[PDB]
From Swiss-Prot:
Entry EC no(s): 2.3.1.97, 2.3.1.-
Name of the molecule in the record: Glycylpeptide N-tetradecanoyltransferase 1
Function as written in the Swiss-Prot or TrEMBL entry: Adds a myristoyl group to the N-terminal glycine residue of certain cellular and viral proteins. Also able to mediate N-terminal lysine myristoylation of proteins: catalyzes myristoylation of ARF6 on both 'Gly-2' and 'Lys-3'. Lysine myristoylation is required to maintain ARF6 on membranes during the GTPase cycle.
Whole-protein residues included: 115 to 496 of 496
MF (Gene Ontology): glycylpeptide N-tetradecanoyltransferase activity; myristoyltransferase activity; peptidyl-lysine N6-myristoyltransferase activity
Length: 382
């Protein structure tokens, strides 16, 4: 409708037909040197996530105050080591871990982050940032703190000479460049139904539901194994080639591919397929992100795996994704989550995913381009 903060920003208007490609406003040769002012009694604090205490403050802020589902029944519970993986990739900067503290008690009440990313958007590649983990404490909601955090990260990114950003959100803002539905594949239906993430079809009993969701105990594809250090270059080569077919994608160096894919227990899993010749031809990956089951007496945490990047050249994608489900089930996950981006629509129904109840919107800051279908979005943010 109208957007008091967003209408002031270099982004297209909702329902502006965009034909051109490029920035919304010219690049700045003078940047504001003073931080934006917070309301009385609050202060900025850049968070040193290498200090275990401070990282545990951020873990607690997000565990108590970050994204919930539409029913206010589940809340993300990013672990401390996951936060390090997501917030310290190659090129991370300390001033881009932007905290807000109560001056008197020092309590952490706000956060926003930027990390650097090279982004391929249609026929342009540009150095941008990815914005994530914007959070204001429940007690501070609806006081227009969020646009101060957004302006302040913007200023800190401008100081580094960067004028574009990419970000996702559940809410509709001016103006999505793509819209993706999330979908969910049940791995432990009795639990999912007990905690009311899922319901039992009116037309299926529990016994039938367990059989419907049952998977084999070991993956089908020959030569599947975890990614090792020797696979970093071929994973990088495969992913670079595979991404060319999408219109919004990252461009990762070999060091960024090692950061984002080399396995870390309970954070990131990557498995490659190594054929009879010793060549790696395919890989699957998914990250670990549990959700707190709010106010529930029994089950406290929902264990969820999320589809990350899956590259196929010799193994059909259908089988690579069946493999990912099997591996997730083996590792104790309750549910396997995926978006309808890249070629995912080719497998979601076939593999018994059910559609969820919302959208994840994709956005660029200060770049106008035409919007794209979900199938052409080739970028996954944590
Ligand atoms: C060149 C560099 C550029 C870098 C910057 C690029 C842009 C980055 C943008 C950030 C990308 C974030 C990526 C992620 O992390 S998405 C994850 C966002 N986090 C959560 O959903 C956690 C739970 N919720 C919260 O912590 C608060 O509800 C948040 C902080 C989300 C809003 O706090 P609060 O509810 O207390 O609101 P307010 O009164 O202070 O502010 C109201 C204003 O804020 C606009 N709003 C509300 N939600 C969002 C949102 N998710 N993206 C952008 N704008 C949002 C809203 O339309 C209104 O603007 P307008 O309608 O008046 O215009
Ligand atoms: C389980 C569960 N626990 N909670 C607390 C929720 C919301 C679910 C639903 C999770 O739905 C997704 C999925 F199935 C696959 C891929 C992405 C998602 C998703 C959706 C909305 C999302 C995100 C990520 C992110 C994280 N980041 C910015 C991408 N922010 N918001 C607003
Ligand atoms: Mg607020």
């Amino acid at each position: 409708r109208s957007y008091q903060f967003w209408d002031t920003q270099p982004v297209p208007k909702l329902g502006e037909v965009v034909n051109t490609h490029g920035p919304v406003e010219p690049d700045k040769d003078n940047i504001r040197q003073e931080p934006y002012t917070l309301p009385q009694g609050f202060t900025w604090d850049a968070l040193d996530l290498g200090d275990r205490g401070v990282l545990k403050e951020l873990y607690t802020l997000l565990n108590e105050n970050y994204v919930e589902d539409d029913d206010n029944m589940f809340r993300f519970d990013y672990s401390p080591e996951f936060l390090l993986w997501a917030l310290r990739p190659p090129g991370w900067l300390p001033q881009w871990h932007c905290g807000v503290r109560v001056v008197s008690s020092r309590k952490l009440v706000g956060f926003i982050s930027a990390i650097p990313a090279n982004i391929h958007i249609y026929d342009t590649e540009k150095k941008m940032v990815e914005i994530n983990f914007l959070c204001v404490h429940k007690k501070l909601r609806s006081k227009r703190v969020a646009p101060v955090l957004i302006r302040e990260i913007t200023r800190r990114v401008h100081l580094e000479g960067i004028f574009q950003a990419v970000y996702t959100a559940g809410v509709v803002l001016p103006k999505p460049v793509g819209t993706c539905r999330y979908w969910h594949r049940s791995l432990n239906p009795r639990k999912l139904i007990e905690v009311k993430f899922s319901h039992l079809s009116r037309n299926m009993t529990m016994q039938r539901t367990m059989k419907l969701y049952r998977l084999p105990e070991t993956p089908k594809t020959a030569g599947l194994r975890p990614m090792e250090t020797k696979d970093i270059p071929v994973v990088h080569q495969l992913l670079t080639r595979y991404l060319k077919q999408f219109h919004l994608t990252p461009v990762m160096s070999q060091e960024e591919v090692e950061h984002w894919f080399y396995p870390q227990e309970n954070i990131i899993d990557t498995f490659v397929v190594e054929n009879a010749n010793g060549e790696v031809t395919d890989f699957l990956s998914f990250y670990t992100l549990p959700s707190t089951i709010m106010n529930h007496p029994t089950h406290k945490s929902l264990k969820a795996a999320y589809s990350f990047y899956n590259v196929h050249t010799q193994t059909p994608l259908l089988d690579l994704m069946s493999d990912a489900l099997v591996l997730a089930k083996m590792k104790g996950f309750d549910v396997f989550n995926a978006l309808d981006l890249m070629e995912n629509k080719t497998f979601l129904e076939k593999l018994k995913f059910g559609i969820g109840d919302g959208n994840l919107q994709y956005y660029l800051y200060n770049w106008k381009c035409p919007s794209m279908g979900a199938e052409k979005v080739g970028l996954v943010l944590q």
